[PDB]
Design a protein around this ligand. Structure first.
Ligand code: T44
Ligand code: T44
Lengths: 117, 118
């Protein structure tokens, strides 16, 4: 059981975006962002096992993807410092969240797939 | 003569996203986000006149678009709290920046168009 999954693709090369740093944060009571989990995407551009059902309670989360580092390593000058995804996790809706982001030097697209499957 | 322009479109209705709130921040000397400019998109889904060439110095800027309020006003409970765009501006001299964002309830796409003053 994996409640939160992250997927990153490269629109320049038509490949998974590998070894991309991802930091997850949870909004705290003082309105500040508290480190929650982190990792680097795998050979398939994915990051799993960030959290468990027990720890993933309702609240506001921020997913930060270090896109600038990724492009620099390819020798490409990017526009964005990073890509950020801020959302509320609600117990009402589906239980699994997939955050998928597509990267270009000057653009990114992000989508969420929320399922019970 | 307008160094920072914001354009927002609606992918569900195929139209400009009107009355969208936009807040711009600049990273301060102490690593905090200081208020820089704000406005609402017009009928054309555009926001102009946020700043001048003079005030828009080199720095790290954050454009925050209030997408949650936009969707809620339409009857939709969207996924994201807001759309945020963070970038370094003018570090090799003055440029003109257009930040364009396309909205759907569970997805958004953002692109930048950067040009060298005419
Ligand atoms: N191995 C993982 C990888 C994976 C997940 C998704 I979700 C996906 O689908 C999209 C579609 C679009 I359009 C995007 O911009 C993006 I990013 C992802 C793709 I490709 C691959 C898995 O299959 O388990
Ligand atoms: N008057 C301003 C307004 C304007 C800018 C852009 I840039 C643009 O083009 C796109 C293309 C895609 I694809 C998008 O998802 C989005 I949002 C905008 C359009 I139409 C209009 C100008 O022309 O200066």
């Amino acid at each position: 059981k994996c409640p939160l999954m992250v997927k990153v693709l490269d629109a320049v090369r038509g490949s998974p975006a590998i070894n991309v740093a991802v930091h997850v944060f949870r909004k705290a009571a003082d309105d500040t962002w508290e480190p929650f989990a982190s990792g680097k995407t795998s050979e398939s551009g994915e990051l799993h096992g960030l959290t468990t059902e027990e720890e993933f309670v309702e609240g506001i989360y921020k997913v930060e993807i270090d896109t600038k580092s990724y492009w620099k390593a390819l020798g490409i000058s990017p526009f964005h410092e990073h890509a950020e995804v801020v959302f509320t996790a609600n117990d009402s809706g589906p239980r699994r969240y997939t955050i998928a982001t597509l990267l270009s030097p000057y653009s990114y697209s992000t989508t969420a797939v929320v399922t019970n499957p």
